[PDB]
Amino acid sequence: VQLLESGGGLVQPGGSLRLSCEASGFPLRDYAMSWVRQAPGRGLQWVSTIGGNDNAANYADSVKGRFTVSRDNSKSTIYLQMNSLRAEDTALYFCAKSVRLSRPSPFDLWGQGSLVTVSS
Amino acid sequence: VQLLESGGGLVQPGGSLRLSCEASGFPLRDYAMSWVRQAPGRGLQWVSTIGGNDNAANYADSVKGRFTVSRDNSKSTIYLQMNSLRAEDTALYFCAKSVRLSRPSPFDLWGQGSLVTVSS
Amino acid sequence: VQLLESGGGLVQPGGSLRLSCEASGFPLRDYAMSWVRQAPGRGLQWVSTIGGNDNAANYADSVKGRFTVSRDNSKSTIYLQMNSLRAEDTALYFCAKSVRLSRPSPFDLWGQGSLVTVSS
Amino acid sequence: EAIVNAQPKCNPNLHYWTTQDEGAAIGLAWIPYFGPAAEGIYIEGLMHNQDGLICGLRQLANETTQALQLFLRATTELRTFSILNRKAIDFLLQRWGGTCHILGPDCCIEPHDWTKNITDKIDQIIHDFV
Amino acid sequence: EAIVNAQPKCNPNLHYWTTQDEGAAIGLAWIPYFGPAAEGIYIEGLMHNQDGLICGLRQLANETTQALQLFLRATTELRTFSILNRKAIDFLLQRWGGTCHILGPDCCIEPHDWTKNITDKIDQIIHDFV
Amino acid sequence: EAIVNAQPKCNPNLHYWTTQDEGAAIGLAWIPYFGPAAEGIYIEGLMHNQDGLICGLRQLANETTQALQLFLRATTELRTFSILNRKAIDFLLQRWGGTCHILGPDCCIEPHDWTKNITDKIDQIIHDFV
Amino acid sequence: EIVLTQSPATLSLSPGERATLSCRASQSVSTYLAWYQHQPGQAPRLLIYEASNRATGIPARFSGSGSGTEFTLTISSLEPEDVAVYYCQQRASWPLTFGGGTKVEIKR
Amino acid sequence: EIVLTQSPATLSLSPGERATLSCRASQSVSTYLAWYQHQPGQAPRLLIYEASNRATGIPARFSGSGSGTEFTLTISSLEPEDVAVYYCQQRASWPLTFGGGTKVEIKR
Amino acid sequence: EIVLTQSPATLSLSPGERATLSCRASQSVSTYLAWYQHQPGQAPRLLIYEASNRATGIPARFSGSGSGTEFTLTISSLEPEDVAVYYCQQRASWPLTFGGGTKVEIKR
Ligand SMILES: *[C@@H]1O[C@H](CO)[C@@H](O[C@@H]2O[C@H](CO)[C@@H](O[C@@H]3O[C@H](CO[C@H]4O[C@H](CO)[C@@H](O)[C@H](O)[C@@H]4O)[C@@H](O)[C@H](O)[C@@H]3O)[C@H](O)[C@H]2NC(C)=O)[C@H](O)[C@H]1NC(C)=O
Ligand SMILES: *[C@@H]1O[C@H](CO)[C@@H](O[C@@H]2O[C@H](CO)[C@@H](O[C@@H]3O[C@H](CO[C@H]4O[C@H](CO)[C@@H](O)[C@H](O)[C@@H]4O)[C@@H](O)[C@H](O)[C@@H]3O)[C@H](O)[C@H]2NC(C)=O)[C@H](O)[C@H]1NC(C)=O
Ligand SMILES: *[C@@H]1O[C@H](CO)[C@@H](O[C@@H]2O[C@H](CO)[C@@H](O[C@@H]3O[C@H](CO[C@H]4O[C@H](CO)[C@@H](O)[C@H](O)[C@@H]4O)[C@@H](O)[C@H](O)[C@@H]3O)[C@H](O)[C@H]2NC(C)=O)[C@H](O)[C@H]1NC(C)=O
Ligand SMILES: *[C@@H]1O[C@H](CO)[C@@H](O)[C@H](O)[C@H]1NC(C)=O
Ligand SMILES: *[C@@H]1O[C@H](CO)[C@@H](O)[C@H](O)[C@H]1NC(C)=O
Ligand SMILES: *[C@@H]1O[C@H](CO)[C@@H](O)[C@H](O)[C@H]1NC(C)=O
Known part of the structure; x- marks a missing residue:
């Protein structure tokens, strides 16, 4: 089983960008999926979690109103659509699989990470 | 509106005396009415309160069994019938109107006072 | 009224012995009956109590499984059947009458005592 | 608040009835088959108007009526037996349902005698500290 | 009080039944339509007469009967489910319904370990008081 | 635990109804004969999905169902009104039904401000001890 | 009974200055507390009720505050006509009780 | 179990004197406490039950008091026949327990 | 939020030694606490969940203990491959939070 992340790179402040995370080797519909980010020289910060339906999203306070997490189970893909980006958002973004759907953790499988750099 | 008190003067210990208090300018039946006394050089002491009916009388402990308060709404007059008078009862007696019938205070109108002196 | 105890004397460790206590002057069926023992130079220790039926027996922990108390109301006699006797059991054994059946004490009548000596 | 009876009249005597929760002690009268x-x-019994307490109570009953009727409007229970038990529960949650902050107006714990015990035991080692 | 069984006989074994408040955990058996x-x-289960506890309990039930019957006489409730809950409420009001006076026979607060903490912290500043 | 809504969909808005325990204050509308x-x-009222609280609550209701159904299996009461009152009683017995051991994880008494009061009153006699 | 204690006993102040009077109760009377003015040989006059509410016709310099066991009457800027004794009064329980009064003197 | 401790262990007193004997329990036994006299080689005899009630035929000099965890037996005026050991006994809980006794000696 | 604090910040230990890592919470999280390993530039890996349960494929030298506000991860005998940062994580309440990590260096 693998998680392959994509969509990273350079983006100007104020722009929009959609990240994707593709699952392989297991049925995506059975598990809650999350986003966790790592800023340079810093630790891990949870960003968002999505449960079984598109309206079952939970967010860190500092991304509410700016980031939207979503899923397309039929294409086995998870998405993060970001808007109103700032310098504080440059980071390596990890996807993370929960052991189950109805609780947010333990994270038993992690992607390799995609770097999103918001900078002029 | 006015409260005019009467009935004061000199009386021997052990005697009886009835004081009256006449209301003018407002309907007496709508308000609780009280008696408060001021001994010479002293402060104010509540003596009695009468509510809407003649049996709705409350008394300071030191006048129970000795003083009776009553009203005649049809003549717009309040009465205090005293018995078994002692030297401690010489005082200026005030009538006092409550702002309502069902609670005993604030006293929003006061009579000028009638002096009752129990002395040999 | 009297309580006359019998059955005491010398017995080897491991043996069995039955003590009896005979009531006179009152109907035995109306009262709870107990056994209390006094080891040499020591105080009083409660041993057992029997209520109204043969299965209503209560015991000190150190005699459970070894001693059985019982009664025969028709012969006005109480019994203590002992087994697996040890050196610690040599003592003067008292019978004791309760003031009632449904509570274990006060003890208002005591027998004179029968000595049981377990010794080699 | 104090109660000032504001009714047209007041019957100053209260000839009352209530139940005896333990109406018999001796004999067989406690057995339902034999009992009353x-x-x-x-x-x-009979209570008189000392301190005007009868006249106050009648007015109190009057003033309770509105709030009681509105409470009965909101319940779906056919017979309500639980108002006093719920009051007791609310009393308990008011004082001990949360953290009790000492010297606050809502915490009823007095350590004043506990103060005289610890202020007398200041001198238990400080005076004999050779 | 201790219980001395004063009945003509005592059955010393108690072959009992009770309910399973959570009688199923796995599968669909919790669903009423599918369940038992x-x-x-x-x-x-089966309990034996260790410590004469069965013989005591039977007598206890006997002695409870009178007081229970008198309680039922005074209520207007058709079915009473609240005796144990009312006991719990009375327990709570007995200890914490009023002010708890420490060292009294009715206040169950122990500050003894709290005593060893404050009597050890007497020496936290009094010995190092240079 | 945190709640992760694991349902196929979530309606994110909650258009609710409830009762007004005191639906009138002025006039005769409190009188049953005249009232609504x-x-x-x-x-x-209308609540929106701030913090995903609506989506969490729906899942919670789902997860409550099994345990609730098993509770209803064990009671003989026809209509149960007492679950929240019994929870309140169990809360009270959990904290104050026994002895409260200070610094333990189950005793919620804070003497920290009481600590600043007794640690400031260390100096009330020890500095002026002439 | 509930004892009401007023403090201070005497006040000598110039016109225009602020005066603060206090009434303390031995147990809580919540907000059931009124203040009355009594000027020499005239009928008493209601000033404040329910601890903070100004009575009709009373000048805006009079205000009341407090709750529980502690209450205050403030006169924001004294005038010569305010010479009087001031009394608090509680109505939470029978018997009704009054404080001992505060006599205000104008320091001209 | 509930441990019962009697004090003092020995008493030497002249005839006519008052004697005070004490029984303490490790936890409350409310009033479920009796006292027995046992004189040398005779059967024990009930003196006091329910902490304070005098048994039939017992002289008026014997009385009992106390509650909770503290109890006292008083003999108001000693006579030579009171030489004996005295025991308290509790009935609040199984096992029934006895105190260790007090031996009273008459100092003639 | 519930703040998770890991200690110590650095660990330098030789192969074969026992390593004890600690995670403390500002309020109780009961047993809702997991531990993850993150070795440089590889994906993170789950080691421990529910404070004490070893994940599949994880060596027996890893164990977890604790409850309430105090938790520990133990590595009973170090090998060179454990150089990594270790994180605790709580799931009792939203927001999910992580500790700051512990970097373990192998002193060869
Ligand atoms: C609590 O005590 C209250 C008194 O302190 C009770 O108040 C009564 O409330 C009812 C409300 O339905 C009133 O009934 C109506 O009153 C109006 C006005 O009354 C006038 O009526 C006669 C005849 O026309 C007139 O001669 C007088 O001027 C009366 O003032 C009538 O128009 C209606 O027909 C109807 O009677 C009572 O009048 C009122 N009592 C008093 C003394 O005002 C209240 O009921 C008590 N609560 C309970 C639950 O009993
Ligand atoms: C709790 O336990 C008690 C025993 O510890 C039970 O006591 C029973 O109470 C009932 C009261 O109705 C008695 O019934 C009456 O008893 C009298 C006297 O009994 C004598 O009767 C026979 C036949 O004449 C005679 O041969 C014996 O001498 C008996 O002593 C009778 O005259 C009445 O007809 C009626 O039977 C029971 O006798 C009494 N039991 C005993 C053993 O005395 C009590 O019932 C228990 N509580 C409950 C709720 O069950
Ligand atoms: C709490 O939420 C749960 C979901 O998170 C709800 O779970 C539902 O539980 C019932 C149990 O009776 C299931 O019903 C049965 O499901 C099986 C399997 O479903 C498959 O059925 C269709 C048609 O064959 C198939 O195309 C799909 O592959 C389905 O997976 C059926 O064989 C039965 O006929 C019956 O429908 C529900 O399926 C299940 N929901 C889901 C989404 O799996 C639970 O009901 C909620 N609790 C309450 C009290 O409502
Ligand atoms: C409080 O006072 C008593 C006085 O008899 C004392 O013996 C006791 O130790 C004190 N309790 C504490 C907790 O200090
Ligand atoms: C009680 O004892 C502990 C001992 O670990 C101490 O740290 C704590 O400060 C003490 N609590 C108070 C309120 O003094
Ligand atoms: C606690 O602190 C206050 C500070 O105002 C002090 O006056 C009071 O006496 C203290 N209480 C006790 C019980 O020591």
């Missing part, structure tokens, strides 16, 4: 009928379980 | 009927919700 | 009918005692 429905009409005979009551005790009676 | 009224007759099948019980569990059973 | 059964259909008119409700108030309404």
Whole structure:
């Protein structure tokens, strides 16, 4: 089983960008999926979690109103659509699989990470 | 509106005396009415309160069994019938109107006072 | 009224012995009956109590499984059947009458005592 | 608040009835088969108007009526037996349902005698500290 | 009080039944449509007469009867489910319904370990008081 | 635990109704004879999905169902009104039904401000001890 | 009974200055507390009720505050006509009780 | 179990004197406490039950008091026949327990 | 939020030694606490969940203990491959939070 992340790179402040995370080797519909980010020289910060339906999203306070997490189970893909980006958002973004759907953790499988750099 | 008190003067210990208090300018039946006394050089002491009916009388402990308060709404007059008078009862007696019938205070109108002196 | 105890004397460790206590002057069926023992130079220790039926027996922990108390109301006699006797059991054994059946004490009548000596 | 009876009249005497929760102690009268009928379980007494307490209570009953009726509007229970028990529960949650902050107006714990015990035991080692 | 069984006989074994408040955990058996009927919700067991506890309990039930019957006489409730809850409420009001006076026989607060903490912290500044 | 809604969909808005325990204050509307009918005692409102709280609550209701059904299996009461009151009673017995051991994880008494009061009153006699 | 204690006993102040009077109760009377003015040989006059509410016709310099066991009457800027004794009064329980009064003197 | 401790262990007193004997329990036994006299080689005799009630035929000089965890037996005026050991006994809980006794000696 | 604090910040230990890592919470999280390993530039890996349960494929030298506000991860005998940062994580309440990590260096 693998998680392959994509969509990273350079983006100007104020722009929009959609990240994707593709699952392989297991049925995506059975598990809650999350986003966790790592800023340079810093630790891990949870960003968002999505449960079984598109309206079952939970967010860190500092991304509410700016980031939207979503899923397309039929294409086995998870998405993060970001808007109103700032310098504080440059980071390596990890996807993370929960052991189950109805609780947010333990994270038993992690992607390799995609770097999103918001900078002029 | 006015409260005019009467009935004061000199009386021997052990005697009886009835004081009256006449209301003018407002309907007496709508308000609780009280008696408060001021001994010479002293402060104010509540003596009695009468509510809407003649049996709705409350008394300071030191006048129970000795003083009776009553009203005649049809003549717009309040009465205090005293018995078994002692030297401690010489005082200026005030009538006092409550702002309502069902609670005993604030006293929003006061009579000028009638002096009752129990002395040999 | 009297309580006359019998059955005491010398017995080897491991043996069995039955003590009896005979009531006179009152109907035995109306009262709870107990056994209390006094080891040499020591105080009083409660041993057992029997209520109204043969299965209503209560015991000190150190005699459970070894001693059985019982009664025969028709012969006005109480019994203590002992087994697996040890050196610690040599003592003067008292019978004791309760003031009632449904509570274990006060003890208002005591027998004179029968000595049981377990010794080699 | 104080109660000032504001009714047209007040009957100053209260000839009351209530029940005897333990109406018999001796004999077989406690056994339902032998005991009294429905009409005979009551005790009676007579209270007079000391401190105007009867006249106050009548007015109180009057003032309770509105709030009581609105409470009955909101429940779906057919017979309500639980108002006093719920008051007791609310009393307990008011004082001990949360953290008790000492010297606050809502915490009823007095350590004043506990103060005289610890202020006398200041001198238990400080005076004999050779 | 201790209980001395004063009955003509005592059955020393108690073959009991009671209910399983959570009679199923796995599968669909928790769903009423699929679960057991009224007759099948019980569990059973067997208790022996260790410490004469069975013989004591029977006598206790006997002695409870009178007081229980008198209680039922005074209520207007058709079915009483609240005796144990009212006991719990009375327990709470007995200890914490009023002010708890420390060292009194009715206040169950122990500050003894709290005493060893404050009597050890007497020496936290008094010995190092240079 | 945190709640992760694991349902196929979530309606993110909650258009609710509840009752007004005191639906009138002025006039005669509190009198049952004059007041509203059964259909008119409700108030309404609209809650949105801030913090995903609506989606969490729906899942919670789902997870409560099994345990609730098993509880209903064990009771003989026809209508149960007492679950929240029993929870309140169990809360009270959990904290104050026994002895409260200070610094333990189950005793919620803070003497920290009481600590600043007794540690400031260390200096009330020890500095002026002439 | 509930004892009401007023403090201070005497006040000598110039016109225009602020005066603060206090009434303390031995147990809580919540907000059931009124203040009355009594000027020499005239009928008493209601000033404040329910601890903070100004009575009709009373000048805006009079205000009341407090709750529980502690209450205050403030006169924001004294005038010569305010010479009087001031009394608090509680109505939470029978018997009704009055404080001992505060006599205000104008320091001209 | 509930441990019962009697004090003092020995008493030497002249005839006519008052004697005070004490029984303490490790936890409350409310009033479920009796006292027995046992004189040398005779059967024990009930003196006091329910902490304070005098048994039939017992002289008026014997009285009992106390509650909770503290109890006292008083003999108001000693006579030579009171030489004996005295025991308290509790019935609040199984096992029934006895105190260790007090031996009273008459100092003639 | 519930703040998770890991200690110590650095660990330098030789192969074969026992390593004890600690995670403390500002309020109780009961047993809702997991531990993850993150070795440089590889994906993170789950080691421990529910404070004490070893994940599949994880060596027996890893164990977890604790409850309430105090938790520990133990590595009973170090090998060179454990150089990594270790994180605790709580799931009792939203927001999910992580500790700051512990970097373990192998002193060869
Ligand atoms: C609690 O005590 C209250 C009194 O302190 C009770 O108040 C009564 O409330 C009812 C409300 O339905 C009133 O009934 C109506 O009153 C009006 C006005 O009354 C006038 O009526 C006669 C005849 O026309 C007139 O001669 C007088 O001027 C009366 O003032 C009538 O128009 C209606 O027909 C109807 O009677 C009572 O009048 C009122 N009592 C008093 C003394 O005002 C209240 O009921 C008590 N609560 C309970 C639950 O009993
Ligand atoms: C709790 O336990 C008690 C025993 O510890 C139970 O006591 C029973 O109470 C009932 C009261 O109705 C008695 O019944 C009456 O008893 C009298 C006297 O009994 C004598 O009767 C026979 C036949 O004449 C005679 O041969 C014996 O001498 C008996 O002593 C009778 O005259 C009445 O007809 C009626 O039977 C029971 O006798 C009494 N039991 C005993 C053993 O005395 C009590 O019932 C228990 N509580 C409950 C709720 O069950
Ligand atoms: C709490 O939420 C749960 C979901 O998170 C709800 O779970 C539902 O539980 C019922 C149990 O009776 C299931 O019903 C049965 O499901 C099986 C399997 O479903 C498959 O059925 C269709 C048609 O064959 C198939 O195309 C799909 O592959 C389905 O996976 C059926 O064989 C039965 O006929 C019956 O429908 C529900 O399926 C299940 N929901 C889901 C989404 O799996 C639970 O009901 C909620 N609790 C309450 C009290 O409502
Ligand atoms: C409080 O006072 C008593 C006085 O008899 C003392 O013996 C006791 O130790 C004190 N309790 C504490 C907790 O200090
Ligand atoms: C009680 O004892 C502990 C001992 O670990 C101490 O740290 C704590 O400060 C003490 N609590 C108070 C309120 O003094
Ligand atoms: C606690 O602190 C206050 C500070 O105002 C002090 O006056 C009071 O006496 C203290 N209480 C005790 C019980 O020491």
